[PDB]
Design a binder for this molecule. Structure first.
Ligand SMILES: CC(=O)N[C@@H]1[C@@H](O[C@@H]2O[C@H](CO)[C@H](O)[C@H](O)[C@H]2O[C@@H]2O[C@@H](C)[C@@H](O)[C@@H](O)[C@@H]2O)[C@H](O)[C@@H](CO)O[C@H]1O
Ligand SMILES: O=c1ccn([C@@H]2O[C@H](COP(=O)(O)OP(=O)(O)O)[C@@H](O)[C@H]2O)c(=O)[nH]1
Ligand SMILES: [Cl-]
Ligand SMILES: [Hg+2]
Ligand SMILES: [Hg+2]
Ligand SMILES: [Hg+2]
Ligand SMILES: [Hg+2]
Ligand SMILES: [Hg+2]
Ligand SMILES: [Hg+2]
Ligand SMILES: [Mn+2]
Length: 263
């Protein structure tokens, strides 16, 4: 049951005036592709707050990568789902090495040393790489049953150029005449149910390959791409959500750089 939205005053959307004329904002299966200018965050914030949405953010920090946690968490505090309930889950082999970061109200952090827990604790799960930092808003506009993010290096490439696993012997195999986009394994998510379905599928697919003595060219990412090809994401995030300015600069097509790689 969704309660009614309150009166709100904002610019009227114009039917005969496209959001962006420089990019595709909807996939062929009618899933929005999230770019700055396509969403009114005030409307979306209202919609998700009225549902008291809790977002879980999961990151793995093993070995030397624990050194990336401080900047990651501090910037997440300034840009990730601000205003909403957030639960960080840090999986690490060095619990005592997790930095003491100050969190805003309604936000929590759990350290798990290396999940039915997720189902009862959060509504959505966002899975990202830790060697990153948030530079701009990353909010509820990304929430949906299942989403993938366009890899910053292939958003303008043709499918035959996509670095999918091309060996038929692999469960992640995708022929050159197939493929919608090349999603990066560093940022995906959705409802807890859909994310667990995805991870379960990939885990099983990888075990099969291992048994057959083969390892997908880009490991987890290869399987993620196979999964999202066969199970279309309900939203696709633009490269604004996964960029590397040192390697790729700042094209005009990107009005904001929200989540970026840390050298
Ligand atoms: C710079 C880098 O080491 N490699 C660049 C490629 O980026 C990698 O792409 C593969 C899939 O083809 C994987 O997704 C891999 O994780 C990517 O590297 C990671 O992400 C990039 C954006 C960088 O941040 C890198 O440091 C990081 O390890 C890229 O696809 C190609 C084409 O642009 O260039 C390579 O230099
Ligand atoms: O020694 C490692 C290597 C990787 N990772 C985790 O695995 C993710 C992906 O690895 P990496 O970022 O090195 O891949 P890349 O972005 O270079 O393709 C990292 O962000 C961490 O979350 C880790 O915890 N310890
Ligand atoms: Cl992840
Ligand atoms: Hg628009
Ligand atoms: Hg996850
Ligand atoms: Hg994760
Ligand atoms: Hg998979
Ligand atoms: Hg996997
Ligand atoms: Hg996967
Ligand atoms: Mn990374």
């Amino acid at each position: 049951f969704m309660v009614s939205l309150p009166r709100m005053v904002y610019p009227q959307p114009k039917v005969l005036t496209p959001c962006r004329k420089d990019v595709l904002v909807v996939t062929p299966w009618l899933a929005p592709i999230v770019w700055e200018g396509t969403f009114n965050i005030d409307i979306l914030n209202e919609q998700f707050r009225l549902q008291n949405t809790t977002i879980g953010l999961t990151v793995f920090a093993i070995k030397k990568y624990v050194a990336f946690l401080k900047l990651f968490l501090e910037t997440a505090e300034k840009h990730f789902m601000v205003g909403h309930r957030v639960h960080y889950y840090v999986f690490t082999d060095q619990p005592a090495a997790v930095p003491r970061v100050t969190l805003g109200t309604g936000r929590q952090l759990s350290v798990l040393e290396v999940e039915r827990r997720f189902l009862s604790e959060v509504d959505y799960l966002v899975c990202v790489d830790v060697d990153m930092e948030f530079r701009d808003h990353v909010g509820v506009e990304i929430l949906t049953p299942l989403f993938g993010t366009l890899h910053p290096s292939f958003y303008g490439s043709s499918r035959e150029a996509f670095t999918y696993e091309r060996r038929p012997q692999s469960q992640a195999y995708i022929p050159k005449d197939e493929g919608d986009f090349y999603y990066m394994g560093a940022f995906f998510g959705g409802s807890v149910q859909e994310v667990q379905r995805l991870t379960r599928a990939c885990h099983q697919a990888m075990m099969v390959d291992q048994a057959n003595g083969i390892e997908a060219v880009w490991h987890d990412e290869s399987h993620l791409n196979k999964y999202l090809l066969r199970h279309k994401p309900t939203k696709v995030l633009s490269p604004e959500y996964l960029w590397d300015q040192q390697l790729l600069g700042w094209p005009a097509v990107l009005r904001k750089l929200r989540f970026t790689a840390v050298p």
